């Protein structure tokens, strides 16, 4: 409903082309501090830490990258850097203390999307890859090497994979299908499809596992968000019988990204979407929009915690520009979302009412506040 203008940002030098899915952020050295991971087509991966401009380190693989990620894949306990090339490859890097990898295993071709999580409830984290040809494939690191698992065949193209709490309270895997549609993949030890009209060939992106409380990030979900390239956004609640509709927003831009971030700091998470022309939307769970217009055309987008300055995690927004630069906005924290004033904010607390009753018309209140604020004596 209102626009803002964030100022503080860092510019990172980056020369190369990439897919929209070849960027992320997470801890690779296991120091509870997130670092930025970017991977271009040319076969190199760059990590960014603190608020430098040059990459922290360069790790070289062989092929052409399509997906990168960081997570607990071997179930060994650490966090690991997974990089899957376009042709057939798959690499792990062991960044925790050039930079040749330490593993290599060929996989099916036409890799498009990557996800690391436990989708069954067995306590072991598996790796899921979607493909350009409506094929989804799950794996597992069998104590070692990566053995395969159930494969799902689809009709509409895939754009995003997400793991979210199911109706009964178990992990469930979603994939996106064109036409603002999605599909739940049957658990791996056949594929159900839901539709939410527009062109049937409309690209759709999905995100899930949005926090709702404070300290519930260990186990909790039920809300997931959808975006379409023609410029519509929706927030859906899982429930059991059907999917409850929370809010639907129609914009006039080409939406191609979808993430979640905590800017207010009250535990809840807010949906963050970006377009090709740089018009970013930030929406809470009560349909409150904040627009940031970075006057530039955008290739890739990212949103999440990042260790920017003085070694401390803070929410950050990351933009990749056609001008070979990456912008990190790190002072993006907001005091609140809506716009209010002192009178409305002070009317909530009953202490103000008690104080006024003990002290004995709105203009009178305004005069009292002016005298209290500007003429204390």
């Amino acid at each position: 409903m209102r626009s803002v203008s964030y100022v503080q940002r860092v510019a990172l030098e980056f020369s190369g082309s990439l897919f929209p899915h070849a960027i992320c952020l997470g801890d690779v050295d296991n120091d509870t501090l997130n670092e930025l991971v970017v991977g271009d087509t040319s076969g190199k991966v760059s990590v960014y830490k603190n608020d430098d401009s040059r990459p922290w380190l360069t790790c070289s693989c062989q092929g052409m990258l399509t997906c990168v990620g960081v997570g607990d894949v071997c179930n060994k306990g650490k966090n690991l850097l997974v990089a899957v090339s376009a042709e057939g490859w798959f690499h792990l890097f062991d960044l925790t203390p050039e930079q040749r990898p330490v593993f290599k295993q060929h996989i099916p071709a036409n890799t498009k999307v990557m996800l690391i999580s436990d989708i069954d409830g067995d306590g072991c984290r598996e790796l899921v890859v979607g493909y350009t040809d409506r094929v989804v494939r799950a794996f597992r690191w069998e104590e070692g090497q990566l053995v395969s698992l159930k494969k799902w065949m689809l009709e509409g193209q895939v754009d995003s994979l997400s793991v979210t709490l199911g109706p009964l309270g178990l992990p469930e895997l979603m994939v996106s299908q064109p036409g603002c549609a999605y599909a739940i993949l049957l658990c791996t030890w056949d594929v159900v499809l839901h539709q939410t009209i527009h062109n049937k060939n409309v690209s759709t992106h999905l995100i899930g596992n949005i926090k709702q409380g404070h300290g519930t990030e260990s186990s909790g979900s039920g809300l997931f968000a959808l975006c379409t390239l023609d410029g519509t956004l929706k927030l859906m609640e899982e429930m059991e019988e059907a999917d409850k509709l929370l809010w639907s927003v129609q914009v006039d831009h080409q939406l191609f990204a979808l993430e979640k971030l905590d800017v207010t700091g009250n535990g809840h998470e807010e949906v963050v979407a970006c377009a090709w022309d740089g018009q970013t939307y930030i929406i809470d769970h009560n349909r409150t929009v904040v627009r940031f217009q970075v006057d530039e055309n955008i290739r890739a987008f990212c949103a999440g915690l990042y260790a920017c300055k003085e070694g401390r995690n803070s929410p950050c927004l990351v933009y990749v520009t056609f001008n070979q630069k990456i912008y990190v906005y790190w002072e993006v924290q907001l005091e609140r979302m809506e716009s209010t004033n002192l009178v409305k904010l002070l009317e909530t607390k009953p202490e103000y009412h008690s104080l006024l009753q003990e002290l004995g018309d709105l203009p009178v209140t305004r005069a009292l506040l002016h005298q209290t604020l500007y003429h204390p004596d």
């Binding site: 803002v4 203008s5 904010l345 305004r366 604020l373």
Partner: protein, 399 residues
């Protein structure tokens, strides 16, 4: 040089401008008026929705301005207390040939019932050729006869200020000689960039100050009823004088904001003239100071100095008075806090746009108009603590 605290200001809204504005674009109304160079004028406000507020920016269309013109200055005021009315004034330039044709428009709806209405004031134009390049539209109030009258002032390319007074008869605004009401505004050398006239409440005296492009700053003490100048003070600085303000810390003082020198404050005008200066430390490190302001920002009851620069900086300065008792630093100005912006800052205001008694800060920068509020949580507890300090003090200390 190092901020002694964090900035308490949070940004609320941001309305983007298609084209840039200039220092004279800002004007009052509780509303606000901002004019772009290419003939587009916007009137800001806020609207109440049950339990929230919504910024509103509505564009205004004035009448006798050609599409090829280019606005230079804008000002406004309210008519003197005896007579109701709102007066607006715009000085633009018609692009008729290589030599532009300066003009001047004055808007006032004389019809009763909708005198204050801005829609009516949109089309009430009075056209007026200039014969000089206008610089700034200012207004002043003068005790004439037994009443008070508000008169315009307009710097011109000719080094003179042109007074435009209204007629109680044919109800127009005509130029009148300056010397009749403002004897201190004669015999200039450069073009007056900013001029400030400070009345003394409950008195027939006043103090006038001005600064020009050559760096010449002149302050004169004048009595109104006698129409006599009491004293003259003059200094010669460097760089254009982008701003001069007169404020009380008797015991009056001025703030001078040159575009190439640190902002300075001259103290004890009536008792020492323009000799005692306090230069604000390290305020020339952020490009060029463009705008300025003097108001209470910390809600303490004492003045603070706001300085907006071209390096996109919003430095705030506080006065360390003699009550602290440190002669090595007694009676000094220190940097309270500092903020950063995305675009160069051109103008500032200080107005309760919302209607809660707290004064929002409107900052006009090259890309648009920012509204900055005090951190509501920070301010929400000051009210309650000062109320608690005053309910117990009601009986315990004073029965």
């Amino acid at each position: 040089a190092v901020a002694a605290g964090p900035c308490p200001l949070r940004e609320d809204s941001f309305t983007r401008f298609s084209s840039q504005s200039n220092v004279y674009g800002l004007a009052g109304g509780g509303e606000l008026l901002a004019a772009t160079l290419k003939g587009k004028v916007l009137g800001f406000r806020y609207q109440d929705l049950r339990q929230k507020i919504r910024p509103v920016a509505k564009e205004l269309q004035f009448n006798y301005i050609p599409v090829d013109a280019e606005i230079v200055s804008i000002d406004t005021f309210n008519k003197s207390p005896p007579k109701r009315g709102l007066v607006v004034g715009i000085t633009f330039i018609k692009d008729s040939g290589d030599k532009g044709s300066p003009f001047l428009n004055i808007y006032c709806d004389y019809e009763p019932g909708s005198e204050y209405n801005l829609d009516s004031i949109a089309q009430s134009c009075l056209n007026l050729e200039l014969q000089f390049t206008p610089f700034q539209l200012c207004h002043a109030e003068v005790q004439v006869g037994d009443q008070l009258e508000t008169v315009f002032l307009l710097s011109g390319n000719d080094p003179a200020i042109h007074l435009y007074k209204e007629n109680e008869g044919l109800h127009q605004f005509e130029e009148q000689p300056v010397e009749n009401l403002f004897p201190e505004l004669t015999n200039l050398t450069s073009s007056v960039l900013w001029l400030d006239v400070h009345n003394f409440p409950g008195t027939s005296r006043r103090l006038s100050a001005l600064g020009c492009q050559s760096g010449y700053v002149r302050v004169a003490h004048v009595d109104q009823r006698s129409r006599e100048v009491l004293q003259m003070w003059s200094v010669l600085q460097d760089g254009p004088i982008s701003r001069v303000i007169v404020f009380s810390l008797d015991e009056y003082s001025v703030l001078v904001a040159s575009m190439l020198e640190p902002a300075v404050v001259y103290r004890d005008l009536l008792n020492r003239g323009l000799e005692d200066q306090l230069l604000l430390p390290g305020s020339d490190q952020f490009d060029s100071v463009l705008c300025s302001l003097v108001t209470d920002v910390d809600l303490d009851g004492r003045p603070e100095v706001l300085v907006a620069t071209y390096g996109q900086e919003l430095l705030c300065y506080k006065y360390r008075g003699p009550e602290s008792g440190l002669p090595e630093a007694q009676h000094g100005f220190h940097l309270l806090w500092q903020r950063s912006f995305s675009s160069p800052l051109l103008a500032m205001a200080h107005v309760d746009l919302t209607g809660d008694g707290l004064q929002e800060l409107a900052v006009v920068s090259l890309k648009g108009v920012h509204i900055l509020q005090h951190s509501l949580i920070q301010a929400s507890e000051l009210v309650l603590t000062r109320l608690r300090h005053q309910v117990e003090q009601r009986r315990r200390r004073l029965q």
